[PDB]
Amino acid sequence: RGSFVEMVDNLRGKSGQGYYVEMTVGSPPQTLNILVDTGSSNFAVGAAPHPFLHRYYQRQLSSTYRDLRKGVYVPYTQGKWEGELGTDLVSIPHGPNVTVRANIAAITESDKFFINGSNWEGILGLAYAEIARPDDSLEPFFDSLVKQTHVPNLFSLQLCGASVGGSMIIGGIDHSLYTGSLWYTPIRREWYYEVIIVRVEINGQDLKMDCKEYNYDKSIVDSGTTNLRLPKKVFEAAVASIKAASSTEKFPDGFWLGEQLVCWQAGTTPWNIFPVISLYLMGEVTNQSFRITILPQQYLRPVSQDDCYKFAISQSSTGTVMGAVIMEGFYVVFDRARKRIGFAVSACHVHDEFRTAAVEGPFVTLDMEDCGYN
Ligand SMILES: NC1=N[C@](c2ccc(OC(F)F)cc2)([C@@H]2C[C@H]2C(=O)c2cncc(Cl)c2)CO1
Ligand code: NA
Ligand code: NA
């Protein structure tokens, strides 16, 4: 408890292409780099020689592979993957010293899934069975891990933006990874890591929307999404306020829509004209909340001879998504055992001399249950 040195720095990434952990599958072990995804629930790996893949799972080489004789088709947007289900022995070399038999989807055909130039070959869905494919009987990796071992039912993530890196602490918390205190928000329902946002401020100015809007139709914590995604009506209100706050300088209307980038000469990004963004989350106690605050350092993503950033807040029709934009400010504890998510200021987050990311409480917020969409 509290210290897991062998797991520190076990994540790598390329900016905007997520964070991956090294895993092994089968016997003898086949090493793969695997995207850490709290937004889905399948352990799915490249299993055929797609041109974009550094490597792939070769089931014929594994003495421990068991075929489940079942296929899985997984459309979404933007993309799709198809595969064949089986089980095999899975380990995390820079994780706990255990080996479990997990479900693996062997991806045999995909569209807009693998990224050309990325260094990962599969994804580790760390969310709940309720959103597993094809259905909730396909046990997710973390569920198997907890069933078959003495690993405590929690994991935590420190994503450090900019080549990026971070830490996935499986089975506990490492106190070196954060400063100040952890504050907890309930997991509303075990499918995605669903939370409830109860208030939103831009530079301390409340958006004053019916808080149900902040959670239409859900709000989730998703390490497999780069951006902070906001429901359309909230995004509209959010940019308008950010536009206003940052009107010292003018940017093309396309910029706020992510349709074009914006640049400055090196060493001269005007951070301070940009507002902080605060989400108040439902707390653990009745009528009690806390707030997490992020900087432009988080929502203006590094992508000429100038420093060019993409506006990394965007509209959604699937609800709020707290992607890397949020998570890179914080140490995030997925406390599955207690159905709660902890946030603390991350010991590695990008800031400046004037402003840092913050996690502050307690605040008094009434009618927070009304903020949940049904
Ligand atoms: N959280 C989430 N993961 C994704 C995903 C892909 C299929 C699913 O299959 C199905 F179960 F929905 C589920 C999620 C993609 C794996 C993520 C992805 O490709 C990605 C690309 N660039 C940057 C990042 Cl941080 C991630 C989409 O959003
Ligand atoms: Na156990
Ligand atoms: Na600490």
From Swiss-Prot:
Swiss-Prot/TrEMBL catalytic activity: Broad endopeptidase specificity. Cleaves Glu-Val-Asn-Leu-|-Asp-Ala-Glu-Phe in the Swedish variant of Alzheimer's amyloid precursor protein
Keyword Cytoplasm assigned: no
Gene Ontology cellular-component annotations: axon; cell surface; dendrite; early endosome; endoplasmic reticulum lumen; endosome; endosome membrane; Golgi apparatus
Localization annotation: Cell membrane; Golgi apparatus, trans-Golgi network; Endoplasmic reticulum; Endosome
EC number: 3.4.23.46
Major localization listed first in the record, in broad terms: membrane
Keyword Transmembrane attached: yes
Protein name from the UniProt record: Beta-secretase 1
Family from the record: Belongs to the peptidase A1 family.
Protein activity control: Inhibited by RTN3 and RTN4.
Free-text domain note: DXXLL motif is required for a proper endocytosis and retrograde transport to the trans-Golgi network, as well as for regulation of lysosomal degradation.
Keywords, alphabetical: Acetylation, Aspartyl protease, Cell membrane, Cell projection, Cytoplasmic vesicle, Disulfide bond, Endoplasmic reticulum, Endosome, Glycoprotein, Golgi apparatus, Hydrolase, Isopeptide bond, Lipoprotein, Lysosome, Membrane, Palmitate, Phosphoprotein, Protease, Signal, Transmembrane, Transmembrane helix, Ubl conjugation, Zymogen
Modified residues (N6-acetyllysine): 70, 208, 212, 218, 232-233, 240
A GO BP entry: protein processing
Naturally occurring in which organism (per UniProt): Homo sapiens
